[PDB]
């Protein structure tokens, strides 16, 4: 692959360094390329903490596959949600910071996060 699954996950979902946050980040992370990705979550924890979720609580994924893991700890995340029926090329998002357990799908060797599945209160 030209972009590994792990690299794709970092691009789509990690932002440990940090109203218009989602508008900027969805665009800069290539999630408004010809289509506005409707929902996307960014995680503000270290990549090592997120990678370690792959050894936490096994749970079923939203698509029904079994390789999803729910974090034992709550994490600082931001949800970006497409708003006002906006369409490419004018994607507008709402920014929602919160603290939730995250659920990720993991794959490979080493076994690392490849998809952000959901968050749980």
Swiss-Prot record:
Q: Name one GO biological process term.
A: defense response to Gram-positive bacterium
Is Hydrolase among this UniProt entry's keywords? yes
**Chief place of localization:** secreted
Write out the biased-composition intervals (Basic and acidic residues). 6-16
Record's keyword terms, sorted: Disulfide bond, Endonuclease, Glycoprotein, Hydrolase, Lyase, Nuclease, Secreted, Signal
Q: Which GO terms describe its molecular function?
A: lyase activity; nucleic acid binding; ribonuclease A activity; RNA nuclease activity
Q: Where does substrate bind?
A: 8, 11, 37-41, 62, 81
Variant or mutagenesis effect after changing residue 63 to D: Substantially decreases binding affinity for RNH1 but maintains high conformational stability
Q: List the disulfide bonds.
A: 22-80, 36-91, 54-106, 61-68
Instruction: Spell out the catalytic residues.
Output: 13, 115
Which residues, renumbered to this chain, are glycosylated?
30, 72, 84
Tissue-level expression: Pancreas and other tissues and body fluids (indicating it may have other physiological functions besides its role in digestion).
- Function in brief: Endonuclease that catalyzes the cleavage of RNA on the 3' side of pyrimidine nucleotides. Acts on single-stranded and double-stranded RNA.
Kindly provide the name given to this protein in its UniProt entry.
Ribonuclease pancreatic
Q: Which organism is it from?
A: Homo sapiens
Q: State which stretch of the full-length protein is shown.
A: 28 to 153 of 156
């Amino acid at each position: 692959m030209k972009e590994s699954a792990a690299a794709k996950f970092e691009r789509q979902h990690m932002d440990s360094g940090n109203s218009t946050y989602c508008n900027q980040m969805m665009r800069r992370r290539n999630m408004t390329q010809g289509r506005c990705k409707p929902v996307n979550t960014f995680v503000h924890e270290s990549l090592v903490d997120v990678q370690n979720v792959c050894f936490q609580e096994k749970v079923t994924c939203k698509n029904g596959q079994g390789n999803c893991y729910k974090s034992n700890s709550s994490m600082h995340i931001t949800d970006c949600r497409l708003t006002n029926g906006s369409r490419y090329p004018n994607c507008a998002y709402r920014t929602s910071p919160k603290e939730r357990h995250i659920i990720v799908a993991c794959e490979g060797s080493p076994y690392v996060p490849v998809h952000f599945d959901a968050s749980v209160e």
